Structure formats: structure tokens, C-alpha cells
Amino acid sequence: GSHMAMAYVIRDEWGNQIWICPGCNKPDDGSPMIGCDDCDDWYHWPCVGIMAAPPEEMQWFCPKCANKIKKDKKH
């Protein structure tokens, strides 16, 4: 079946999901990654502009999702 994972995710030899950062196209090295609150994609910190971990209580959206959101001037 072609249904594997057409996304930035692969499995290792044991069968764990290894997320690939769509930012650099590099896999996870056991690195701190941030998941978007919309697409749930997994990017590395230096790839999106994160340097310290924000809480799950605070939302964050990647350059993918935050762009469609736009974060318009009107608030």
C-alpha cells in the first residue's frame, strides 16, 4: 500500500516516527523540535526562529500556518 506517510515523517528500523523538519529537510537528531498548533508539523528550533521552549499553553504557528492567519492589523 502506498499509504505510508507522505509528509515529513519517516520510521526508523524499530518503527519509531522520525520527524523531518520541512525547514531544512533534515531529520530529527534527537533535537528539540516545535510542533505547530495548526498543522502539527514538526520543525527544528533554529529552522523557525525558536531558541527556548514555549509552553503548550501558548500557541505557535509556523511560517506555513501563521501566513494564512496573516496576523492582521485589526485586533
Binding site: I18, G30, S31, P32, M33, I34, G35, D37, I50, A53
Partner: peptide, 13 residues
């Protein structure tokens, strides 16, 4: 903002 490190060894966390 789900932040986690897939680590079996991390310094601090």
C-alpha cells in the same frame, strides 16, 4: 507550541 526533544540523553531538558 509543543516542544520536545527526542532524546535518550539531554542536558537539563
Amino acid at each position: 507550541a509543543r516542544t520536545k526533544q527526542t532524546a535518550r540523553k539531554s542536558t537539563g531538558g
